[PDB]
Amino acid sequence: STTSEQSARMTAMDNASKNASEMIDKLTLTFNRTRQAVITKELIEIISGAAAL
Amino acid sequence: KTGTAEVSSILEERILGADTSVDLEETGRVLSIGDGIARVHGLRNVQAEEMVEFSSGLKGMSLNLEPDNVGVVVFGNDKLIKEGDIVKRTGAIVDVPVGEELLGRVVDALGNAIDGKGPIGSKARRRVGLKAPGIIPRISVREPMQTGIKAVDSLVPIGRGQRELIIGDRQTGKTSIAIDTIINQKRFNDGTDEKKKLYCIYVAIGQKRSTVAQLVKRLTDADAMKYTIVVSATASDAAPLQYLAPYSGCSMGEYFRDNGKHALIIYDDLSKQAVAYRQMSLLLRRPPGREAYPGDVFYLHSRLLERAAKMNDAFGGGSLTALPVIETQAGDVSAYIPTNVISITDGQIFLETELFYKGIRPAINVGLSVSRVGSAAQTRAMKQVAGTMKLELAQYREVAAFDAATQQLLSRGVRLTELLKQGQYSPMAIEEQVAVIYAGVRGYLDKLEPSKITKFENAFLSHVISQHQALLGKIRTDGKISEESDAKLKEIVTNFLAGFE
Amino acid sequence: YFRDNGKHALIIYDDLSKQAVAYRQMSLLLRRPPGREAYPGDVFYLHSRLLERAAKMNDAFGGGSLTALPVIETQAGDVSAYIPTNVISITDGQIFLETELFYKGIRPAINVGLSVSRVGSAAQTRAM
Amino acid sequence: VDLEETGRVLSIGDGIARVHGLRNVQAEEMVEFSSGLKGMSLNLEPDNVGVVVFGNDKLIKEGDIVKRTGAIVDVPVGEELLGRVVDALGNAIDGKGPIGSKARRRVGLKAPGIIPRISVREPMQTGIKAVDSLVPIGRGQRELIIGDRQTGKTSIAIDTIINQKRFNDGTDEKKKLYCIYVAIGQKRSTVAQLVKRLTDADAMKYTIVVSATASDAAPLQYLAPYSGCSMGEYFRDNGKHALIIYDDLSKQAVAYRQMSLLLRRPPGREAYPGDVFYLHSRLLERAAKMNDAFGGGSLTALPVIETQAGDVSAYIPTNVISITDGQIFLETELFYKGIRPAINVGLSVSRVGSAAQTRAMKQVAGTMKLELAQYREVAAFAQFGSDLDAATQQLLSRGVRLTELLKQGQYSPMAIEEQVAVIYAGVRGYLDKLEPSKITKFENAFLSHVISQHQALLGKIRTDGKISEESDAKLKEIVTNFLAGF
Amino acid sequence: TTGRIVAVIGAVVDVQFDEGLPPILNALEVQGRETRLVLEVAQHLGESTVRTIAMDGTEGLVRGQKVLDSGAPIRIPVGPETLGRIMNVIGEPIDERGPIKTKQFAAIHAEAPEFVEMSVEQEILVTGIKVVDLLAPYAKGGKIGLFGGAGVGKTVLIMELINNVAKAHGGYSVFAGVGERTREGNDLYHEMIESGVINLKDATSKVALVYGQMNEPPGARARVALTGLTVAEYFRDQEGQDVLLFIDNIFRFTQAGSEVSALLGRIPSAVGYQPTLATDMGTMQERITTTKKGSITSVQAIYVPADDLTDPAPATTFAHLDATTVLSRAIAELGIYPAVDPLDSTSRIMDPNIVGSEHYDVARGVQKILQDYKSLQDIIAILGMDELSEEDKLTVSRARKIQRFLSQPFQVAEVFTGHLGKLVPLKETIKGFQQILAGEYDHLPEQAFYMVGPIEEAVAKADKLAEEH
Ligand SMILES: Nc1ncnc2c1ncn2[C@@H]1O[C@H](COP(=O)(O)OP(=O)(O)OP(=O)(O)O)[C@@H](O)[C@H]1O
Ligand SMILES: Nc1ncnc2c1ncn2[C@@H]1O[C@H](COP(=O)(O)OP(=O)(O)OP(=O)(O)O)[C@@H](O)[C@H]1O
Ligand SMILES: Nc1ncnc2c1ncn2[C@@H]1O[C@H](COP(=O)(O)OP(=O)(O)O)[C@@H](O)[C@H]1O
Ligand SMILES: [Mg+2]
Ligand SMILES: [Mg+2]
Ligand SMILES: [Mg+2]
């Protein structure tokens, strides 16, 4: 049982690490999209204020 | 640099010396109407933020006083104004009628009756844009405003003269909190304790008229209209009306405040007054700011909410409670306008849209809901029970994601949390709230099933209201829970519990 | 021209994600107010008016036809970006070309899970 | 009336005078207002001139008369400044009298070309182990110090300035380094406490503190770095070695942005004009190492940048990261867990590298770098610690000792030979049998011991600049003997 | 001179003159108003026009109205008569007790002390708050900041600091309230009157309140800070005495400038703030300083919009303080009050030379153990806490004990907590944290330390919990 438990924990934590990495892929893509959106939005606000005056 | 009035139609008047024939002091001609904003040439004697009257019955409010023209905003649809129309002053800063005549009328932002029951017979008028009381007139908030909602009255007490803020996502039950509050005051208003009568005002900003009509029907159903005003600036109404509705309502309430009476006013929503203001400013070519909101959209709400005060006894002892309602987008309470208002008010009720599905209605997210006035504005009996109840919930809230002692703690916490649910348009007297809270917090429900407390609450309330009204009257009049009253409650709770199963 | 003279045509725009960029340049240089991702609000009408011409005239109008195969290109395979959704709501179908199916040697990389054709079974040889 | 050598203010407000006249005024020229106020003519437009006022616009009415001084901005220079506190234009603000400098220079001169320079090869000793060993700084380098709030950047700069006292008090002349500390947008009391701190360590006889504090008008904060860089180019162009510390370079960018947005230039990203790269590049490109035909002098630069939330992808942090020859990250997470100076040695770099390390420090830090590199990739296990083989166990038992050697204290830089001795003891392996918590004590003891008895060995390491196998053996003997009796 | 209004747009009024022009910062009185409206000049637009910011609501202004140039910036009463009063931005009283009759008037705009005038001494200022005294000790004469989100404890903490220090202070005091609730201003006024700090009958008051609460139009919220600062300037220089200066809030001084900026014709900066944010704040924060001729122990509460310490306003203020105590919402959620964040509050006197070796060692030990606990929580998230080694379960337990022990009950929070406010002199704090770190209290439950003063009280509370068990 000890050998089986340790093998199972190895497999389970390997699967958990792979799930976490596969989630970080999507989260990083979303983070980059949102960062660019924030930059564009702030810039458009600045230039729309500048034009309005 | 081209002045607005540097047009041919005007310079021609100037050149051929005919300008003297027309009045350019108390009168003006529309240079250019468009999108709900008029530019007017003339009116050299028009006051800033004065009301003016177009040549077709429409009114406007001269906001911009530029060197050569006047930026007027129409309180209506500009379909009827035409370049060259004659604009004539009204002489007075925009003001709205006030009095006890409005009570029970669906008045409109400018004080005109839209309920079709005839003209408002008011006597006095107040400027919408008046300064709030100073440091000296006010005193500390001391009296309780009974919301009639177990959770709010227990863990988020609201005093009279205090500016709460019901903030939460769309469709989480904010208007329901407001209407429970309005309906609750019925018991006080139908009485002789003239110092506890509360007069309610509901400002409906940018909401479809079907909603306001259903709300007015709901209020008439509970006959909670004899002491309610409803200032309705709905979505179809021009932006200036939606921007002025909060101030019309606030002045209607400053009336009752300046006469020793107690008022409640509920702006719903303020996030739509902000949108109307932004539209106005952008159409007056004022530079934008964050998210295009004008630079001064904080002052817009601060100068509104600061008028909710509690006057000292040398100023009549009146009161004006305010309950602004904000709508966050995705629980993003850290947005621009929600953040603007969260720091203007003193207290805040957080309606979470996942407490609202997990079962908890009203969704009040205790722990994030605060009342900076705090226990200072609570009843002694409710103070007593809430002291234990809030602490027990605070402990249960950190061991909720699951021994014997802690298992008992979790059981008690779930019991309380099921004791804080409630229906709609069915507020409870403070005596009944304290009765059930005491029943649940001593431990007289530590064995009953979780799914059965929802019905034990109702059964126990019916039993007490039908059998031991003397005890409730004693608790309510005495204010506090006396030892003999405590023993009577103990007896009653144990008796009903034993014969309930 | 063919479509209106009774013949059958097929037009492949490659890419339409690089016409919208040229149009965004054209607009921002006219000072027009940028919108979402700096694209003008017009960037829909630009593609809608172009792709609404891929019609199929009935027999009382010659009977011709003009198929269209717009080719959009998505950064990091984000199907929910602005232009990809602008065009996904103008067209009658879509063929998603995954970049990980492609890297597995499975070519052409059509992602049959997401691909669809909203005329589909109609206009398909009975044998197939 | 004269409208070529003289003009009159059309408008004023927010510090941006709009002058009418001054037809012969050059761009970036220093005009003078009738109220004893100076100004710099930035916008030359067909109808007017945009002057930025060096001071308060309360004294600039409309219709005032502005007269052009005929010269581009210039600052005094020389060894007459050393030990003084000057403002963004050379005026003394320490109240020790006038400055009395014969020479002058233009703030906006151009950097040396490609031929005058020569590859950076001398070491600029910062007296900080973590820097001197793992992220070395040569003479003629530009090593950004980029960090968050209260992480220890100004302290790195001041330790560097204080350390040079040992060289400046000697007789070797090509090791003397003169320091300049440009303090931009800082509370005056901060600069006063800093000047007191430098005086305490007696490091104020070869330092020039240029002060452009928070109250100063935007142009003075815009102009302080260039004043300092000119006072440093003077030492560069005379066979002397200088070290200029801009602190920070983000507040110069903020002041420049303010002037631009008030002159109504197209905003750009984060409202920064299009010149916030040109602005910093044409400043940091003046840190050079002239070849012998040009004197042989040099001018190092240590721009300090604050990053909000460790965000090094912002506009100005990336602008100044793509201009410099390295960077010394100072993370706060490490600051609070004992690692002070909190120099994250993973993100820190020096594109010059070990080309600017003394042969002894090369000999030792070459392997210390690899030991820490290996430790940093099994750091996570440190908590588990057990359940792992002896390989990673020894890796992260060496790494912990090496880390605890790099801790250091306020205003106490170490001579290069002593850093070499300590890192030698630590990395050659004479500490792996010691409880980590005691390592510091050992250091603070061992150091002193070596300073007292074996001064001759330290002298030999310092002069030879190398650990000769004779010196290597003697040092091993010393370490073994001391470690025995601890 | 005498000009005439020509345009009114929001709180920004343009005035055209035919006599000489009034320099910038001058105060112009609008003629024909029931209550004094003062316009502070802010720009010269050419053609003998000046753009100005109205210090009070511009309701009912008319193009062509007459305006008289007062001839000097806003002048306010000063002297030991303003003690116990309440003042506007323009200095006229708002507590309804007659005029402030002084000999001295001061202009609210004045340059800052030169570099040759600064002090360089630093001596810890014991406040009686464990966390503040231990991890980020304040300093006499230094500038102090309380960075908070909304509803974290800035105002309760500043009231605690008032109660503690202002009552036990030889010198005077000043409380400039810039653009925060009027309820709070009245509450403070009554608290002081009821606590003897202010005195209505005689001349024995030690506080000179100034108020620009959030109903004042932006032109007023952006200046009342300068008015309170002028009163403090006088008490620092002319009286030649020590002074305190509590400001609450100092964000509104920036927010008001942002509000008026666009109408003044300025392109907006990064986050909608005015382009002149940094300098408009330096010209103010550089007058709040100790000098060789006085001393000001300024404390300032600072809103942090949406708990974003990277916002331009707090980010820029951080550089103007000698000590910051960053209140945190996350800690306040755990019930620890004050919410001060131990791993974000810093100081300039936290050195082994200025506060002593043992104080420094203990402060750094507290910080290091809390940081280690922060690292461990990540593991505890997955493994559970029974799996932790035995050198770390000790670390977690000790860190929780220290977190609890950093909390304290204030005398002004008796309304909320019900407990009794306590003051913990420095020695008790250092000794108690030494002991908690050393392990001399591994046998008491962590909840024994929650909201207690000195360590002996934690021992007594543990005993009482055991007995009542
Ligand atoms: N205590 C409650 N119990 C059960 N349902 C409730 C309760 N409170 C509110 N609801 C339900 O929530 C829905 C929306 O409530 P309400 O309209 O008051 O919230 P709201 O957020 O103001 O809506 P909106 O924002 O869209 O105007 C209603 O259909 C109502 O039935
Ligand atoms: N090597 C060190 N050892 C111990 N403490 C240090 C060290 N370096 C800095 N500190 C501490 O860190 C604190 C901040 O130091 P420092 O002023 O250098 O940071 P900073 O980035 O300059 O701050 P700011 O960004 O506010 O100017 C100081 O109180 C100092 O005591
Ligand atoms: N020391 C404390 N003890 C108990 N509760 C506190 C304490 N400090 C703050 N609180 C709670 O947090 C709320 C924060 O309000 P306050 O600090 O007065 O305003 P601000 O938003 O300026 O911080 C208080 O109303 C109080 O309920
Ligand atoms: Mg609703
Ligand atoms: Mg610094
Ligand atoms: Mg506050």
Short mmCIF file of C-alpha atoms in Angstrom, two decimals, chain B residues 335-486:
data_model
loop_
_atom_site.label_atom_id
_atom_site.label_comp_id
_atom_site.label_asym_id
_atom_site.label_seq_id
_atom_site.Cartn_x
_atom_site.Cartn_y
_atom_site.Cartn_z
CA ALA B 335 -15.06 50.89 -10.86
CA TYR B 336 -15.04 54.66 -11.22
CA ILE B 337 -18.50 55.76 -10.07
CA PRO B 338 -19.02 52.98 -7.50
CA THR B 339 -15.70 54.04 -6.00
CA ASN B 340 -16.75 57.68 -6.16
CA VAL B 341 -19.87 56.99 -4.12
CA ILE B 342 -18.45 54.37 -1.75
CA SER B 343 -16.27 57.07 -0.20
CA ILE B 344 -19.06 59.66 -0.04
CA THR B 345 -21.49 57.59 2.03
CA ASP B 346 -21.15 56.22 5.57
CA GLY B 347 -22.06 52.57 5.35
CA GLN B 348 -22.82 50.22 2.49
CA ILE B 349 -24.96 47.14 1.85
CA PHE B 350 -23.24 44.72 -0.51
CA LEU B 351 -25.68 42.69 -2.57
CA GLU B 352 -23.69 39.75 -3.95
CA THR B 353 -25.14 37.90 -6.93
CA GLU B 354 -23.86 34.50 -5.77
CA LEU B 355 -25.19 34.77 -2.25
CA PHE B 356 -28.38 35.35 -4.22
CA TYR B 357 -28.28 31.90 -5.84
CA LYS B 358 -26.64 29.90 -3.04
CA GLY B 359 -29.93 30.58 -1.28
CA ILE B 360 -29.42 33.76 0.71
CA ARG B 361 -32.11 36.30 -0.11
CA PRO B 362 -31.70 39.21 0.56
CA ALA B 363 -28.17 38.77 -0.74
CA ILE B 364 -26.65 41.12 1.86
CA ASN B 365 -22.99 40.12 2.07
CA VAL B 366 -22.37 40.59 5.77
CA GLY B 367 -18.73 41.10 6.60
CA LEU B 368 -18.42 43.39 3.60
CA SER B 369 -21.48 45.42 4.58
CA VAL B 370 -20.61 48.12 7.10
CA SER B 371 -22.46 50.92 8.88
CA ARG B 372 -20.03 53.59 10.05
CA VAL B 373 -22.76 54.93 12.33
CA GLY B 374 -22.91 51.45 13.80
CA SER B 375 -24.62 50.30 16.96
CA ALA B 376 -25.07 53.95 17.92
CA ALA B 377 -28.22 53.92 15.76
CA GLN B 378 -29.82 50.71 17.03
CA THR B 379 -32.48 49.71 19.53
CA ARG B 380 -31.41 48.38 22.91
CA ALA B 381 -33.10 45.00 22.44
CA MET B 382 -31.65 44.63 18.96
CA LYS B 383 -28.30 45.76 20.34
CA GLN B 384 -28.48 42.95 22.90
CA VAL B 385 -29.31 40.16 20.47
CA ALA B 386 -27.17 41.43 17.59
CA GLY B 387 -24.12 41.63 19.84
CA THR B 388 -24.07 37.84 20.08
CA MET B 389 -25.49 37.16 16.62
CA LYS B 390 -22.92 39.20 14.69
CA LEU B 391 -20.07 37.62 16.64
CA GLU B 392 -21.34 34.09 16.08
CA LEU B 393 -21.75 34.74 12.35
CA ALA B 394 -18.27 36.27 12.26
CA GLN B 395 -16.82 33.09 13.73
CA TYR B 396 -18.88 30.80 11.50
CA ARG B 397 -17.71 32.75 8.44
CA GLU B 398 -14.09 31.61 8.85
CA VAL B 399 -14.88 27.91 9.40
CA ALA B 400 -17.51 27.67 6.68
CA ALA B 401 -15.44 25.72 4.14
CA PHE B 402 -15.62 22.37 5.93
CA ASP B 403 -14.70 18.04 15.94
CA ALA B 404 -17.59 18.72 18.33
CA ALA B 405 -17.28 22.35 19.45
CA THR B 406 -16.66 23.60 15.92
CA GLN B 407 -19.39 21.32 14.60
CA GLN B 408 -21.77 22.98 17.04
CA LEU B 409 -20.47 26.35 15.84
CA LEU B 410 -21.17 25.46 12.21
CA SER B 411 -24.63 24.18 13.08
CA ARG B 412 -25.46 27.41 14.91
CA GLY B 413 -24.09 29.50 12.05
CA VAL B 414 -26.24 27.70 9.50
CA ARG B 415 -29.23 28.12 11.80
CA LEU B 416 -28.68 31.87 11.96
CA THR B 417 -28.05 32.17 8.23
CA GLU B 418 -31.37 30.44 7.59
CA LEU B 419 -32.92 32.86 10.10
CA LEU B 420 -31.81 35.86 8.01
CA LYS B 421 -33.66 34.89 4.84
CA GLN B 422 -36.93 36.67 4.13
CA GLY B 423 -39.56 37.16 1.45
CA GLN B 424 -40.55 40.38 -0.28
CA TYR B 425 -42.79 43.32 0.57
CA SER B 426 -43.20 41.65 3.97
CA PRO B 427 -41.09 43.61 6.45
CA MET B 428 -41.20 42.77 10.14
CA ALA B 429 -41.67 44.93 13.20
CA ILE B 430 -38.53 45.29 15.28
CA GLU B 431 -40.16 43.35 18.12
CA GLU B 432 -40.68 40.29 15.92
CA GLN B 433 -37.15 40.55 14.52
CA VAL B 434 -35.66 40.56 18.01
CA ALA B 435 -38.00 37.77 19.09
CA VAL B 436 -36.89 35.39 16.34
CA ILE B 437 -33.23 36.41 16.59
CA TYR B 438 -33.30 35.73 20.33
CA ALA B 439 -35.02 32.41 19.69
CA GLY B 440 -32.26 31.43 17.29
CA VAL B 441 -29.20 32.81 19.08
CA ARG B 442 -29.74 31.41 22.58
CA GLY B 443 -29.78 27.88 21.18
CA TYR B 444 -33.47 27.04 20.97
CA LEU B 445 -32.91 25.89 17.40
CA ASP B 446 -29.63 23.97 17.76
CA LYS B 447 -31.50 20.70 17.09
CA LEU B 448 -34.22 21.58 14.58
CA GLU B 449 -33.41 20.78 10.97
CA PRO B 450 -31.85 23.41 8.68
CA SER B 451 -34.58 23.14 6.04
CA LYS B 452 -37.23 23.52 8.77
CA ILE B 453 -36.06 26.83 10.26
CA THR B 454 -37.42 28.64 7.20
CA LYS B 455 -40.90 27.50 8.25
CA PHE B 456 -40.34 27.54 12.00
CA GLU B 457 -39.67 31.26 11.70
CA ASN B 458 -43.07 31.85 10.10
CA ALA B 459 -44.90 29.51 12.47
CA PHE B 460 -43.31 31.04 15.57
CA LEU B 461 -44.06 34.55 14.34
CA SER B 462 -47.71 33.68 13.75
CA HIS B 463 -47.90 32.07 17.19
CA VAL B 464 -46.43 35.09 18.99
CA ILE B 465 -48.51 37.61 17.04
CA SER B 466 -51.65 35.60 17.80
CA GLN B 467 -50.98 34.69 21.44
CA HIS B 468 -48.43 36.92 23.21
CA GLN B 469 -48.85 40.37 21.68
CA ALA B 470 -48.56 41.84 25.17
CA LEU B 471 -44.94 40.70 25.37
CA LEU B 472 -44.10 42.24 22.00
CA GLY B 473 -45.79 45.49 22.96
CA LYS B 474 -43.84 45.55 26.21
CA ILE B 475 -40.53 44.95 24.42
CA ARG B 476 -41.29 47.60 21.81
CA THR B 477 -42.46 50.31 24.22
CA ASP B 478 -39.77 49.59 26.81
CA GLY B 479 -37.23 49.55 23.97
CA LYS B 480 -35.09 47.01 25.81
CA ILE B 481 -35.63 43.37 26.74
CA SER B 482 -36.37 43.34 30.46
CA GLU B 483 -35.55 40.34 32.63
CA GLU B 484 -39.21 39.44 33.09
CA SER B 485 -39.65 39.93 29.35
CA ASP B 486 -36.61 37.73 28.78
#
